[PDB]
Design a binder for this molecule. Structure first.
Ligand SMILES: O=C(O)c1ccc(-c2nn(C(=O)c3ccccc3Cl)c3ccc(Cl)cc23)c(OCc2ccccc2)c1
Ligand SMILES: O=C(O)c1ccc(-c2nn(C(=O)c3ccccc3Cl)c3ccc(Cl)cc23)c(OCc2ccccc2)c1
Lengths: 257, 264
């Protein structure tokens, strides 16, 4: 258990670290998506020609490779954020690897929702915007690989969470005591209890009209687990189909077992 | 919603849960701890004797003679029997019968799998499972040891149960939790999501308060119980994949066609 002023201090600590670790914030992403600004307007990629012009090997692959490159970048930013979570770096080292192995993907989809609306996703630190249409229309398995992310984002974004909320929620995901192969579950759950308490109080003060948002947000962790599972199975199909294509070692290790 | 209203809802659901389900968790734990001794099925010979002596309804011979198949089919028979108990309990949830009839059917169709896994945990410990309203006890080792895919079909249930039971929920907790599962607004094909999520919001409030008063020492048990809905969705998805593999591999399975229709 934790006292109220301590929970507020924990939320601010985590928000502060989240700002320092993730360069493209939800607040910034929404300002770019909403427009009414002449200085932050993205170039829109909606077909092959605008893709060619936007840049100033096969297209579905190039886009896929672009996604993997950005995901590796996200794993780095998420890893840096995790170190800031009080108690994380004090855990057994093998458990640190384990929590990150199973948590980074759930966080990537979570934070990817910040870059999405129902019509597309921001890319290249907000400078570009690729339409859901164009991604959904990619050939072979790649088209169907993009759309389920949009489906989750539309539902997740309906919760209207801001960055200060997401900062604690991401922490809760990482500090999951039910990951396979964890050696010392007890110290992980003690931290998650602190984070969960901090999330609860945070949501109450920041969304007081939004009844049971706490519970509704935790139920979204179920959606996350599903899409991470869907993702892995699609990668295996691409691995057996496109054998000229290579994954980053960091990603390679993450998906082993 | 006021605190006294939440307790009234909780008590309402508990009373109905007692009436709808034959073997409560409270009773099951009395049998499992040894506190009227159940017949124990731990191998082939004891199975033969129990079905001759006790005569368990879901594991009487009926087309197939192979044991592992009969046990597998017996689990499905009991699951279909459970669906009716859950359906009757759902009728008691305030607001449920007022929902669109198609929506009632949709909530039950996609929810029963999660509820069965949940309530099966009440009947399990790390060593086995109660059957036939507590009269029998089938050991985990005997179930795990069934041949080809059948043994591996049984074990994941125990693995979930053991983890779930560590929350030490009681029937009054479970009655509200089961209600929350039923009123899931994200089921495919729902026509009117709003009144479903409004009811679930009431139930979640009632569940939260129940857990605070029933388990004040158990910090964030609410959140931890909500995290188990992930495990449920996961194992239910796995369950489907295992049935499909058994369906394409096992042709010793055919039952009387009317039986196939009932237990589809
Ligand atoms: O900025 C960001 O935080 C961030 C995080 C993620 C993804 C992403 N990964 N991604 C993947 O397949 C993937 C995810 C996790 C691990 C490995 C992979 Cl391989 C996507 C599939 C579809 C979509 Cl719509 C997005 C992604 C991301 O895509 C931006 C992008 C889209 C199109 C072309 C180039 C880049 C951005
Ligand atoms: O009484 C009870 O509430 C109740 C609820 C459940 C199951 C059950 N379903 N079951 C299933 O495949 C199943 C089918 C659909 C949905 C969920 C499930 Cl989980 C089992 C698999 C293994 C085991 Cl060990 C038990 C079950 C149950 O099994 C009693 C039983 C055990 C052995 C042989 C015959 C019957 C009892």
């Amino acid at each position: 258990h934790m006292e109220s002023a301590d929970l507020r201090a924990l939320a601010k600590h985590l928000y502060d670290s989240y700002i320092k670790s993730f360069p493209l914030t939800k607040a910034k992403a929404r300002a770019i998506l909403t427009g009414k600004t002449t200085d932050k307007s993205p170039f829109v990629i909606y077909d092959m020609n605008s893709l060619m012009m936007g840049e100033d090997k096969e297209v579905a692959i190039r886009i896929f490779q672009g996604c993997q490159f950005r995901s590796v970048e996200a794993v780095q930013e998420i890893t840096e954020y995790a170190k800031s979570i009080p108690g994380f770096v004090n855990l057994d080292l093998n458990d640190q690897v384990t929590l990150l192995k199973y948590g980074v993907h759930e966080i990537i989809y979570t934070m990817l929702a910040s870059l999405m609306n129902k019509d597309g996703v921001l890319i290249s630190e907000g400078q570009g915007f690729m339409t859901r249409e164009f991604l959904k229309s990619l050939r072979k398995p790649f088209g169907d690989f993009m759309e389920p992310k949009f489906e989750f984002a539309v539902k997740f974004n309906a919760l209207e969470l801001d960055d200060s909320d997401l900062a604690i929620f991401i922490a809760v995901i990482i500090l999951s005591g039910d990951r396979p192969g964890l050696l010392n579950v007890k110290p992980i759950e003690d931290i998650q209890d602190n984070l969960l308490q901090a999330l609860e109080l945070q949501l109450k003060l920041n969304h007081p009209e939004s009844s049971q948002l706490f519970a509704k947000l935790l139920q979204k962790m179920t959606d996350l687990r599903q899409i991470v599972t869907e993702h892995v199975q699609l990668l295996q199909v691409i691995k057996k189909t496109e054998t000229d294509m290579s994954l980053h070692p960091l990603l390679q290790e993450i998906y082993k077992d």
